[model samples]
Target: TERLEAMRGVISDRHGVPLAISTPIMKIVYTEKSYKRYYPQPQPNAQIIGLTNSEGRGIEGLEMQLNTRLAGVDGEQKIKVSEVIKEVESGENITLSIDSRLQYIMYRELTAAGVANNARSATAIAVDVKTGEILAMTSWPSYNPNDKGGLSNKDAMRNRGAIDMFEPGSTMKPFTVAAALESGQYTPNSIVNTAPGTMRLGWHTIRDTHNYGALTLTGIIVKSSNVGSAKLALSLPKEALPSFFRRAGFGQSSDVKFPGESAGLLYSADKLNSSQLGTMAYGYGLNATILQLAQGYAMLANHGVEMPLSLHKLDQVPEGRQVLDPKIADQVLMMLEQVTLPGGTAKQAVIPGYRVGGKTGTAHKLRADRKGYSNSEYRALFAGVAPVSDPRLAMIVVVENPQGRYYGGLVAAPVFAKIMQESLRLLNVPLDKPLD
Candidate 1:
């Protein structure tokens, strides 16, 4: 009895607590011990770890990219289940380029827009123009990485900004205009007739919201006339449009290389019929993810230089490839600035103390079971850059399947203004325009 009591006291002193008093001696008898192990070490933080599990949820996004380094290594025991085992090595810490402050803000704003408009989903992304670093990227209907309950809802787990593709609508006009300028056949002041607000191409007709008679290159972009854009696109050589789109990073995956990331579709001019060509000019018959659009706009902001997008922080600014003539890019930037003025399509996107430039895109959602678009469903998109005199940030907002109003200017542009306003302040970017 005394020996048992002494053993209990010794165990308590070593382990801080004694075994349960009711535990039977025979039950506690020692036996050859077995060992268990865990691999792909658990993350101490959950939010940024993203969605990754071995049982079913595989590593995704940045989590999967750096998993090997993060998992470290397991060492062998010196003895069979004995105390002289080798020292355990911890995994390396990874620092991402994502700004938590901006990420939280985007998440909040996107969630608000989705809830307010009863939207099916929403996505927002912001990038640093000079560094090519992704600042904030988020999707609405997001899932909690820490909660197992979200595993069943695949829709909530999708990173729509990186993966989903949609027709860009009128937002593609600026690129088409850029292509025309590069051809040297059209200048910023060149005029095109868009009378009657409609034009016929083969068996199809391209129409605009209103008749914009004899609009110059600048007015074509500012008014966002589908007929005017189609005219400008057709004037260029057959291969010109597709070549420009390819250089703009369309039909290619971004540097992040996230799981299921989509490289948007772009067809050659030879493959497009007359109707397809006209609609493509106004942003149809092709598809692009929100990140792809943001990168394209970022190229314009970078003075025609296309920098490789990055998910990790960069120590040095990488040399960028020049995709457009610097002079032509400057002309396009000046024309895009008119898009936020009184008569423009995205008047709601203007900020109080900044010179803003952007385009609106309202595309009909294609039906899942049929070959046509849904009349009642639409996708609203806005892509823009801030302080246009010397650009610093590029952003895109996409709202899917809104309930009532479905125009990009009405639904998506306001979200762009809110996020860009706050993000510019956070970045301390200089204001190019004075407040009223």
Candidate 2:
């Protein structure tokens, strides 16, 4: 007689759609009545739900994370006699916070953008700012769990939201500006000289896309000026910027406990020089994953409270801790709104019948040799909250290695706009067309 392996639990989306489940097939395995793992929604949900091996052991993703609970105890039966001593117990079912409806929207848009731009990959994450529940998360180049024959690139199987680190690029500006506002040294109208659009500090030279002259703090973000952000960073104590970054969840693990969850590297120096500070200010120095970026921006959208992100559908949502001042975060939200206006860099991000606020970030990828920035490869990023009148959602979009148009506003913003528009309506958020 063969041992009977317990059935693995079913993984379901928030709406009760099966993500991964165990089904008994004809003569399960080698002549024994056992169970085999199956993915109901193979591609869009594959990276998160994960898969099991031939021995029916959890291998990756949530299947691996909750293996103990998902894989129950095996039972043994006596040989040659009609007797069974131990009974196999089925595993516990897991219900995630993900909404398949939203996942469908995100996956469709992300994959389309990746193809249209001829990109290496694209990632998008959306969360409920109040609860920190991830409603939608997916990346381009997803794999089919049922087949690996078409899977040549391992990077495509990697969940960019969980496993990868990237510089937020100009998307980091709002936090720096928020820090400035929090310190009381600058206001939204405070002026910084960005003339000639280029400046030198130590061995490094910094420049913006163009010379925008002396501009207000709001204008600095609207133009996505590296020179302006550099000036802002240098004007503050080194401790201030890093303090904000740390409090906003940089250089910290997400506590997702998922198999490949990783914290990005953060460099904060007591003896930090002008060049390094300037670089950090414009979103160059520190790196974070798409998940952390969503958590950080969700903090801004949630009135300066840090809501811990979650995969499971939480019954009693944890109370968020205060990170930034409520008023200051709201003020930063206002500044971000300008970035999507007519004169701003992310005009394409505007949502009809709603007030939109977000930043545009276009970062150059590090060369393969790890020496300097690559001239061609780029990451387009857009991270922000929506309906500035009353923020409800925090989303981030990243398009990696876009071939032709790599700017965040041009490549990533449109995706954000489409996905977010659908999300707002689906979530039943009230529309407020602010009379700007």
Candidate 3:
């Protein structure tokens, strides 16, 4: 008995928890001390696969990707009835690229926004423009990782940012404009006839918020005219639409490798009808996750370089594909900057002392009962890059089913501004604009 007690004490000290040992049996258990802090709790429903399995064989997220390196080589132990002769092997410590400070900020803000809007859910993600590291990623309706009960609540376990797909609404307009510019069919100063603020395509008519007459290409973006964008989209070769979207990382999994990450829905141009083509120009007839949108905008912030999104800290700067001409990317970015100015669609997204650029999307939620679309439910989204003089960060905010007001500019943009302002200040990024 005395020997067993001594062995228990040694194991307890080493493992920081008590262990039970019986005739040829050993078991480990959690205690009060196990509940220390909660910042990095497996990102609640991030679907990191096997990390939370009771059997300890989960293969999701960083746990799965770096399992071998983290677990190290198992050491052999020779024992004779409670007597240890030898033991070898300890796991190596693993570090992640997630910034706890930024993560907490994202979590708090997301939770607050979700609660304030009485939203079904909310998600936010922040990424470094220079590198591909994911600084912060969070989802609302989060579960407590410390409690196994969370596993039973599937809704709380979903990583909405990377897994849930939604129509992008106007957030997709910039890509359409980029494709237009790349085709050499339009220029920043080219005039688009949006006079009536509505365009007829097949059986439906596309309408804008108002009659924006004769807008320049820049004006078309600043005003976010559905009519203007639809006309431009129809003018392009049908193949250009899907090709540009695919190049923007739409229909493909982000390199982060989160379990169950959605690639989003991108319809083939050959399969689209005239109505589908027109609606797609303004971010319909397609779907995407919040992370995909953030990464796509990050490509623009990186001067057209499309880098792989990373969840792990990288040692050296990674190279990426040149997805857009630098000059064209600059032009598109300048046009996006107009989006946060007064009279723009997302003025609420502007941050003090920062040149913010972003797009707002308000997409109607598809009905679950197979009845076309829901009358009251909508997804509000804002994706943008900040300190636009030299972009440093790209972030996205998505709020699902907000009550009362549902515009992305109203429901999601303020959340973006709040989180971006604090994030930039925390990173100590130099301000490109002076505070008025």
The numbered model that scores best in TM-score is 2
lDDT tens per residue, model 2, 1-436: 5586788888899878988878886563145567877776777887787777888777778887788998988887877446778987889989999998888889999989989999888899999889988998898888888775656447766677888887888889988888888888999899999999899878888888788999998988898888888888889887887778888888887857567687887777685676787888888888888888899888888899888888889889798879989988888888889889888988889998888899888778778999888866878888978878888889999888887554444688888999999998988889999544
lDDT comparing candidate 2 with the true structure? 0.84
- Model 1, 298: alpha-carbon shift in Å? 0.4
Model 3 lDDT, residue 370, Cα: 68
Global CA lDDT of candidate 3, please?
Answer: 0.75
Count of clashing residue pairs in every prediction: 0, 0, 7
Which residue pairs come into collision in candidate 3? 45-157, 48-60, 48-61, 50-58, 50-59, 50-60, 75-88
- How close to the true structure is residue 271 of candidate 1, measured as C-alpha lDDT? 92
Question: Cα deviation in Å at residue 154, candidate 2?
Answer: 1.6
lDDT of 3 by residue, 182-287 (tens): 9999999998899778788887777888999999889888999999998898889988888999988897879886777788999888896767888888999899
RMSD of each: 9.3, 2.4, 6.0
Q: Per-residue lDDT of 1-436 in model 1, one digit per residue for the tens?
A: 0111111101011112211111113323353222211212122112233544532222655455565655455444443334524554544445556666677678889888899889998888888877788878887877655445525345665677887888888888999999999998999999999999999988777788898889999999999989998998778888888889988888788877777789989999889566677778889979898878988898898899877787666778898878899998888888888999988888889999899999988878768877677866888889999889999889999998887454444699989999999989987887889877
Model 1 ranges with Cα > 4 A deviation: 1-49, 54-58, 79-87, 150-152, 368-372, 404-409
Instruction: Put the candidates in lDDT order, highest first.
Output: 2, 3, 1
Q: List the residue pairs that clash in candidate 2.
A: none
